[PDB]
């Protein structure tokens, strides 16, 4: 897969079509967002739950959300 | 191999087509890589000049 280093860069990636799934995986110290778009799995690793929830509210509504297990 | 003599490989230029030709002389004594073997009728008499 590939890694992203700007929240703008990942938010534009979430606006990118040919994408269907976003996996929010609550790890202990950090939480990762994973777009499964096409040919790649775009990962942005972020450190705050508050930044996580306000990123969640920035998520494009047509793109499906699934928080992992 | 199958010959005990060494075997030279001389490069040229074709005077009719733009192309370099690679031909195989017999390595006469004393020639080294980088010699100007000059071959023809009015070739000046040195080692290697046929």
């Amino acid at each position: 897969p590939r890694k992203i280093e700007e929240i703008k860069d990942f938010l534009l990636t979430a606006r990118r079509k040919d994408a269907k799934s976003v996996k929010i995986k609550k790890n202990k110290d950090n939480v990762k967002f994973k777009v499964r778009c096409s040919r790649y799995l775009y990962t942005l690793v972020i450190t705050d739950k508050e930044k996580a929830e306000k990123l969640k509210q920035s998520l494009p509504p047509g793109l499906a959300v699934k928080e992992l297990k | 191999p199958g010959r005990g003599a060494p075997l030279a490989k001389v490069v040229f230029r074709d005077p009719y087509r733009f192309k370099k030709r690679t031909e195989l002389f017999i390595a006469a004594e004393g020639i080294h890589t980088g010699q100007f073997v000059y071959c023809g009728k009015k070739a000046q008499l040195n080692i290697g000049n046929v």
């Binding site: - | 060494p6 390595a27 006469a28 080294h32």
Partner: protein, 91 residues
Amino acid sequence: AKRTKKVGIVGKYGTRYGASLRKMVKKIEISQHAKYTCSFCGKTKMKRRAVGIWHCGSCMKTVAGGAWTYNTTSAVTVKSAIRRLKELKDQ
């Protein structure tokens, strides 16, 4: 140290192959293995490749010389004649 006091390099064949044969190979195993003084690159990396090919490490210029030695008694003499028949008043 003077380990083998007569044979020199032909202490590798050992007990066998006859006396006068090993005497007559000793003179010519030395000659093909020596590091001759190159006339071009100035160094002594003249090392032979396969028989009749000689090769220097620096400047990598490959010269066909003798089969076991670098020159030959024929090689010097024909070089003596061919310049001499060259300076014979226009060829």
